């Protein structure tokens, strides 16, 4: 009746964990490393994005895969912005009005027509006019990424370029990163694994990662307003710790960061599913674990930056392997077991928290 297909190369970091988890929580279901000619039994195919069969997922209810079909509205940072913007319009109280770093796409030919480019992206103009945020002007192709806060400052940046490439991203900039003693003043972002299961349950994995920058954070001035110069200089010539292990963050601040994360994830999936534009279409026979990247400011406030599909789970060390082992244990015991008509395995003080449930 039941079948499990694991087409992931045996060299991949998650192979051993997935096999132990399939063995433990689905002992009666055989594991195969090859997709059969036809799917005539209920099956779960855990593969790399390209190995999965999207046509058999939308047409055959027997075939279950570790991916959704329509997820562009959240995994694409341009479209993510649109999903959030259109949702906050009718949802003023939403955490997403604070917990998201907006980005915009601008096309500027010459500095003298900067005002026309700001009209061709009216959302951006209004934001810059509000004068409440810091911004970064990133040339989409790698004259250096520069900081500004006002239209005149942006105008002066463009004027100085004239005395190249025309596409640019204007991304909200966090001038305020949380700087910890123990990390020797190196900033970090949070990688949070989020598992969507069927139509629709959203599960946030509470054992999160803090990925630190190599160098000590140096805030830019007006004399020097560029960042990642070593990246633009590179074209002219051709640390990971578990978040909860950071004790310089008081425990109640760590809990508030978790609360904000669960709220932001829940709100995003409500936004994604309900938008009147391009939306996330949950499938009953799909599950997917995404990599949510959040920035933390010096006031312990989170800011969603992006959602990454098929994230690299590869780590080094025993403590980080334990983290990934418990992740795939929860995914298999809670999300995979029910698609084989087996009850979801529950254990007290779970780190796999259900943050949203939709009945559809």
- Domain with residue 250: its CATH number is 3.30.470.20
Do 191 and 152 share a domain, yes or no? no
Specify the residue for token string 């403590």. 319
Do 113 and 189 share a domain, yes or no? no
CA atoms of 7 and 5, how far apart (whole Å): 6
The answer to whether the CB of 2 falls within 8 A of the CB of 342 is no
Do 327 and 257 share a domain, yes or no? yes
Q: What is the 3-state secondary structure (H, E, C) of 57-115?
A: HHHCCCEEECCCCECHHHHCHHHHHHHHHHHHCCCCCCHHHCCECCEEEEECCCHHHHH
- Residue among 340, 344, 343 at smallest CA distance from 41: 340
- The dihedrals phi and psi of 44, each to the nearest 5 degrees, come to -120, 115
Can you name the residues that pair with 13 across neighbouring β-strands? none
HSE-CB at 187 with a 13 A cutoff on CA atoms is: 15
Do 143 and 269 share a domain, yes or no? no
**Got the DSSP string for 174-241?**
-SSB---TTTTT--EEEEEEEEEETTTEEEEESS-EEEE-SS------SS--EE-HHHHHHHHH--EE
Do 185 and 149 share a domain, yes or no? no
Do 131 and 268 share a domain, yes or no? no
Sign of the four-CA dihedral 17, 319, 258, 308: negative
Question: Quick one: residue 182, left, alpha or beta (phi over 0 = left, psi -120 to 50 = alpha)?
Answer: alpha
Do 335 and 190 share a domain, yes or no? yes
How large is the angle between the packed helices 15-25 and 318-330, nearest 10 degrees? 40
Q: Kindly state whether residue 300 falls inside one of the protein's structural domains.
A: yes
The count of structural domains within the chain is: 3
Do 264 and 339 share a domain, yes or no? yes
Both tokens of 327, joined, read 């992740």
Which of the listed residues 173, 192, 225 is the one where a domain comes to its end? 173
Do 169 and 303 share a domain, yes or no? no
Do 33 and 151 share a domain, yes or no? no
Do 148 and 210 share a domain, yes or no? no
Q: Kindly state whether residue 286 falls inside one of the protein's structural domains.
A: yes
Q: Kindly state whether residue 93 falls inside one of the protein's structural domains.
A: no
Do 164 and 270 share a domain, yes or no? no
Both tokens of 177, joined, read 């990163």
Q: Kindly state whether residue 223 falls inside one of the protein's structural domains.
A: no
CA atoms of 96 and 303, how far apart (whole Å): 9
Length of the chain equals 360
Which of the listed residues 138, 155, 173 is the one where a domain comes to its end? 173
Q: Kindly state whether residue 96 falls inside one of the protein's structural domains.
A: no
- Non-local CB neighbours of 356 within 8 Å, separated by 6+ positions: 200, 201, 202, 265, 266, 269, 270
* Enclosing domain of residue 156: 102-173
Note the maximum CA span of the chain: 71
- Domain with residue 144: its CATH number is 3.30.1490.20
- Non-local CB neighbours of 335 within 8 Å, separated by 6+ positions: 195, 197, 198, 201, 203, 287, 344
- Non-local CB neighbours of 250 within 8 Å, separated by 6+ positions: none
CA atoms of 343 and 347, how far apart (whole Å): 12
CA atoms of 197 and 285, how far apart (whole Å): 8
Q: Kindly state whether residue 316 falls inside one of the protein's structural domains.
A: yes
Q: Kindly state whether residue 234 falls inside one of the protein's structural domains.
A: no
């Amino acid at each position: 009746p039941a079948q499990i297909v694991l087409t992931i190369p045996e060299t991949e970091y998650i192979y051993g964990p997935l096999n132990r988890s399939f063995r433990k929580h689905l002992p009666n279901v055989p594991v195969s490393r090859s997709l059969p000619v036809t799917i005539d039994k209920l099956t779960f195919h855990y593969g790399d994005y390209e190995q999965l069969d999207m046509d058999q997922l939308m047409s055959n209810q027997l075939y279950h895969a570790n991916s959704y079909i329509y997820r562009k509205a959240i995994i694409r940072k341009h479209y993510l912005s649109h999903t959030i913007h259109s949702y906050v319009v009718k949802n003023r109280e939403s955490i997403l009005n604070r917990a998201f770093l907006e980005s915009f796409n601008i096309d500027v030919d010459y500095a003298e027509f900067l005002d026309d480019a700001l009209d061709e992206n009216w959302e951006l103009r209004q934001e810059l006019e509000s004068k409440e945020k810091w911004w970064i002007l990133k040339p989409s192709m790698s004259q250096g990424i520069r900081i500004f806060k006002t239209i005149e400052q942006l105008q002066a940046i463009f004027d100085s370029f004239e005395e190249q490439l025309r596409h640019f991203i204007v991304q909200e900039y966090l001038h305020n990163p949380l700087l910890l003693s123990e990390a020797h003043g190196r900033k970090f972002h949070i990688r949070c694994y989020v598992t969507c299961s069927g139509d629709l349950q959203v599960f946030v994995y509470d054992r999160m990662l803090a990925l630190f920058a190599p160098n000590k954070f140096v805030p830019p001035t007006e004399e020097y307003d560029v960042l990642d110069i070593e990246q633009l200089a590179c074209h002219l010539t051709n640390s990971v710790i578990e978040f909860d292990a950071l004790k310089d963050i008081p425990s109640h601040r760590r809990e508030e960061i978790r609360t904000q994360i669960h709220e932001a994830v829940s709100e995003l999936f409500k936004a994604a599913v309900n938008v009147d534009r391009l939306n996330f279409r949950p499938l009953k026979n799909s599950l997917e674990t995404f990599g949510f990247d959040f920035l933390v400011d010096s006031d312990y406030q989170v800011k969603l930056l992006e959602v990454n599909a098929f994230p690299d789970f590869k780590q080094t060390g025993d403590d980080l392997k334990n983290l990934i082992d418990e992740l795939f244990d929860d995914v298999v015991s809670i999300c995979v077991r029910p698609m084989f008509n087996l009850p979801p395995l529950h254990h007290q003080h779970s780190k796999f928290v259900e943050v949203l449930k939709l009945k559809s």
